[PDB]
Each structure stands twice: as structure tokens, then as C-alpha cells.
Design a protein around this ligand. Sequence first.
Ligand SMILES: NC(=O)C1=CN([C@@H]2O[C@H](COP(=O)(O)OP(=O)(O)OC[C@H]3O[C@@H](n4cnc5c(N)ncnc54)[C@H](O)[C@@H]3O)[C@@H](O)[C@H]2O)C=C[C@@H]1SC[C@H](N)C(=O)O
Ligand SMILES: NC(=O)C1=CN([C@@H]2O[C@H](COP(=O)(O)OP(=O)(O)OC[C@H]3O[C@@H](n4cnc5c(N)ncnc54)[C@H](O)[C@@H]3O)[C@@H](O)[C@H]2O)C=C[C@@H]1SC[C@H](N)C(=O)O
Lengths: 302, 302
Amino acid sequence: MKLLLFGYGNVGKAFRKLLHEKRSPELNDVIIGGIVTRRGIMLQDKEDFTPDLEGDVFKAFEKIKPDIIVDVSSANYNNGEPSLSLYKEAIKDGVNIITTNKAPLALAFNEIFSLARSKGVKIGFQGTVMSGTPSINLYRVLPGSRVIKIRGILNGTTNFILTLMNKGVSFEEALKEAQRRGYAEEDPTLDINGFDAAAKITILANFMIGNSVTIKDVKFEGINRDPKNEKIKLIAYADEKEVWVKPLPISQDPLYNVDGVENALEITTDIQSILIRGPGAGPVNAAYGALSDLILLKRDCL
Amino acid sequence: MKLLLFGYGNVGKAFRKLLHEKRSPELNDVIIGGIVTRRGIMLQDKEDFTPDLEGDVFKAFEKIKPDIIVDVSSANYNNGEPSLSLYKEAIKDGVNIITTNKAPLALAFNEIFSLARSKGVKIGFQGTVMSGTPSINLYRVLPGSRVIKIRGILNGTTNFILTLMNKGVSFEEALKEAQRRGYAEEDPTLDINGFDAAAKITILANFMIGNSVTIKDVKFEGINRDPKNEKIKLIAYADEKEVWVKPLPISQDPLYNVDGVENALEITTDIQSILIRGPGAGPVNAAYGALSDLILLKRDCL
Ligand SMILES: NC(=O)C1=CN([C@@H]2O[C@H](COP(=O)(O)OP(=O)(O)OC[C@H]3O[C@@H](n4cnc5c(N)ncnc54)[C@H](O)[C@@H]3O)[C@@H](O)[C@H]2O)C=C[C@@H]1SC[C@H](N)C(=O)O
Ligand SMILES: NC(=O)C1=CN([C@@H]2O[C@H](COP(=O)(O)OP(=O)(O)OC[C@H]3O[C@@H](n4cnc5c(N)ncnc54)[C@H](O)[C@@H]3O)[C@@H](O)[C@H]2O)C=C[C@@H]1SC[C@H](N)C(=O)O
């Protein structure tokens, strides 16, 4: 089983590390055929990236001819490219996809999944929501559950910022520490303006609720520079009717002690209501989400 | 695929109902070959139980010759019988097991699972811990996770009792309402003396941590008749060293607002710490745990 690793930022690097450390006994026939960044194409599995040739991800795809693409490249919410057209080509060629990049799915979920379904192609996408805390994969172990509504804190970066700000840390310093820890999107405004949280609730609305929705039609906003009296959280919500993201005051609520980089998800089904909580961001966490998807794919359980 | 339903109390009945209601599209070739209670053996799938013959579960097993046994019979913590010897016979004959009954696993986990592993037999046991709230199956979507420690509220009945008692309800009235709702073990003392919670932490220690442990060596105790000043919870805990159950005062703690029949589980791994919470007991909830295991077995994902 040959992987093409698309992206080698903090998640890509942590994924390669986790694969090597957790190789036995299920992942021995899984090889990284090649790694692609903006810098070019490495046709090796090495810790340090060195291009063997220049070329984009499509050249790398044609060269490596992989069984699976691991998409750990950065978000593009304008048109989802190049990931979007890459997913289309891969599915058409019967190549499986594991992604931590939310952009293609938040824009064209129903199209991507119907394309993959017709081809018998599998898509792992746990890393797109709450990183390594089962969300997508939590739903996989809730078969036959009819999801009525969902609510939660889905952005690690802004939650970490708000938490630090009440420990006497300035906005700019909080953001810089979030970036230092590698919590933030490459474009940190995607966290700040609520684009990232909006992408995640879109994905969840599509997958869990069955509401066919693009990020383009989701009403959302982010956090502020400003406080002190109440506890603010960025709340994402979806039911069969509405999908939104908005900062809100939270009463001394199940989402109240969800602090630092921690995220949480409340799922209401026909059967019951459940809540899961864990780290929402963190390169190792996100990479573990992708690794979980890989092991599950190996087990034929995606 | 032919099921033998062993037990037809509230869980058994809710399981049969859920199977019929969630039949499409994955479960159409799943039939209940027969149902066995203390009253005898019905060789039909009917809502109302009527014996077609007298005989125990072994007679029913020989008569039906099932692909899977669904064990929703009552707990026996003395020796785990008849379920224990039934599991042995079933595994030997290559028959899969789905159980909500904790007793055999809490007594002979390592033996049962090594027997099944050698035979390629699958065991679903989600319903044994936190009913329909992924616990066992949550771990299934955490592959490669090394579980360091676990802590939680694992008994629905006692948690419901404590909650009602602060709404001006007496112990006896709280217990009677727990029984009315069908939360309690057939022997309600199993809830009260902490046997049920102890069974669940034993199962989890075995499956998640890898600590080979029987309930016989777990130090445990239950709730009291007595309060008023603090919030008491029955806390179960396991790490690589110790396994225990004890009532404790809980500070205004992640397990603090876990009230009524709700249960919760804190899992600490090499990667991260996560918490899941949902109803811990409830016939429909437990039966859904078993149904989840059935769908996963159908998908070859147990
Ligand atoms: N960083 C994290 O912890 C998380 C990351 N995410 C996603 O994981 C993905 C990767 O993250 P990260 O490692 O930080 O990547 P980073 O953006 O730092 O680097 C992207 C990599 O892709 C390559 N690349 C980008 N565009 C390319 C193009 N057009 N052609 C060729 N190569 C290209 C770059 O060269 C680089 O190697 C992103 O899509 C994230 O959105 C997934 C789980 C989390 S959620 C984080 C969120 N900010 C929050 O606070 O909730
Ligand atoms: N009831 C619930 O909501 C839950 C049930 N559990 C387990 O599910 C199992 C069944 O529960 P329930 O429907 O209430 O069963 P119940 O005990 O009411 O009836 C048992 C059935 O098995 C049959 N049976 C028992 N022994 C037999 C024998 N030797 N030969 C032939 N037939 C026999 C009986 O005739 C009867 O039909 C039990 O093992 C429970 O421990 C699983 C999830 C929950 S956890 C509940 C726990 N008390 C708590 O508060 O946390």
C-alpha cells in the first residue's frame, strides 16, 4: 500500500513520525511513496524534506501512482484547489483519500462522497473535526443513529486564545503562542474569523445530519479583540433546519469548562444525547486522526 | 445470519424492536432464529414470548445452530454460568458473540478473548459498559492508542438514585423508579454494592489498558443510605497498577455535572486525554449498544 503525502507542515511531519512509531503490526505494508510540498516532490520517505524534482501535486500523483492520498495541505476556501480537483482525479482512478484538510469537503461534500461511492473509494476525514478526538469516527461507531442536532466548540485556536487572555495574556501574544504550538491555520485569520469552525460544522451537518450544505451558505463569525464578566465561547451548531457559528456567553452549560485547546461535541440522536471532549488542535493530535483513519482503512472499516 | 437471543428481559425486547425498526439496508439477512428465557425456548421471532419447548440455553443452541449468540441474560458473578460455558461452546463451534451481560467477561476476560482469537471468532461487548454510549467501541476507533489510565461514573442506577435523593426522593423510592425505568440489574444489590461498576472497570482495564484482571481481585464498594453538603459520585478507576471503585466527594471536576442516569468515561492515552458522556443505563440504550455491535460485525469491523 503506497501513500502520497500531500503536505509536510506540522501535521504531515507528525503523521510520518506516528506512522514510523506505530508501524507494528498492522501498517508494515504501508509505505510513503512520496511527499509533496510547495517546494517540490520528494520520492522517498525521509524525516527531512529534500525535493528530488520540481512539480505540483498532479505530477507527484502521476509519478508515484499511489493507493491512497493523505491530504495534509493547507485550506483554500475560495475554490478548494488544488485538493478538490486532485480528489476528483484520485477517485476516478480508484485511489482512496485520507484528509485533515477541511476545504474540499466543506465546499463540495455531497459531490465528493457521491463520486467516491460510485467508484467504491474510501474517504477518511477524522482529522478535519476535533483532530484526534473521535468525531467523524465516533459517528462510525454509532450506526443506525439518526442525528437530530449537534452543538460544540470546534476551533482549538480561538478557544486557546480566550483561555490565555484571562490568564493576563494579550490577544497578539495568545495568537503567537497558538502558532508556536502549531494550533493555527497557515492563514491564522481562518481561525479568527470563524472560517475553520464553520468548515467543521458544515462537514458534520453533511455527514451526521444528512443536510446537504456548503460553507458558502453557512452564517458565521469569529472572536473579538475584546469580556472579564462572563465566559465567551465560539459555538457551532447544526440541526435539520439551521447551521451557524457565533461567539456566545456560556452559563456556569456542559461546554463551560471546555478550556485551552480543548474542543467538545454534543450529539443528539433518536436514541440519546452524547458529548465527547478532547484536544481540538495540535499537530500530533490531527496526525493521529489521520493515522486512525489509515488503520481503519487497513481494516476495511472506513 | 442466524441469531440466538439469550434473554428476553427489557434489553432483549428493546433489541428485537430496534432490529426490526433499523432493518434496512444492512440487516436484512439477519434473523432471530430463536429466543431463550428461563421460561423455555421460542423457535420464532415474535414480539410476545411463548415457549415452543422447555429446555435450557444449550438445548436452544443445539436446536437453532446459530451464527451469533446475543447474550442479554442476567449477571452471575459467582461463576458466570451458564453464559461462561455457553461462550466456550460457541467459540469452539466458531459462533460469534454479542453480549450486554458483563459477568463472563469480568471473570474470565483473557481466557475468553484468547479462545476467540485462536478460533477467529468475534466478540461484541459495547452494551457491557455505558450501554449505547461508545466505550468499548470508542476504543475501536482509537487504534494504536496506549491507554495509561481511566476514570469514570460507570453505574447508571446509583447515579440516578443519588440525583433523585437531592430532589427530595427517598432511597427506596429512587431505587423503585430506577427499576420502573429498567435501569437496575435483576438483582438490584449488584448496582447498590458496586458489583456492576466493578465489572465494567474490570472489562475496561482488560480491553483498554491490557491489565489482565478478574473482578474477584478488584477492591470495590457501593453507595449508602445516607450527604446534603457535598456531591457524592461512585468513581471507578484503573491504571497499569491499580483498579478500584469507591464513592467520593467531587469538587465543583469534569465528573461533577454527570447527573441522573448519565455516565461518563475519562480516557488518558499516550496521545491525549478524552472524555465521553451519555446515558449509562436504559433498556433501549443497552440494546442499541448490542445493535451497534451487530452492524459492526456485519461490516466485518469487530
Ligand atoms: N494544526 C492543527 O492542529 C490542525 C490541522 N488541521 C488541518 O491540517 C492541514 C495541515 O496542517 P499543517 O500541518 O499545519 O499545514 P501547514 O499549513 O502548516 O502546511 C501546509 C503544507 O502543505 C503544502 N502545500 C500547501 N498548499 C500547497 C500547494 N498548492 N501545492 C503544493 N503544496 C502545498 C505546504 O508546502 C506545506 O507543506 C490543514 O488543512 C489544517 O486545517 C487538522 C486538525 C487541526 S485543527 C486546527 C485549527 N486551526 C484549530 O485551531 O482548530
Ligand atoms: N438494564 C440496562 O439498562 C442495562 C443492562 N445491561 C445488561 O443487560 C443484561 C440484560 O438486562 P435485562 O434486560 O434487564 O435482563 P433481565 O435481568 O431483566 O432478564 C434476564 C433475561 O435472561 C433470562 N435468563 C436469565 N438467566 C437465565 C438462565 N440461567 N437460563 C435461561 N434464561 C435466563 C431471563 O428469563 C430474562 O429473560 C444484564 O446482564 C445487564 O447487566 C447492559 C447495559 C445496562 S447497565 C445497567 C446497570 N444496572 C446500571 O445501572 O448501570
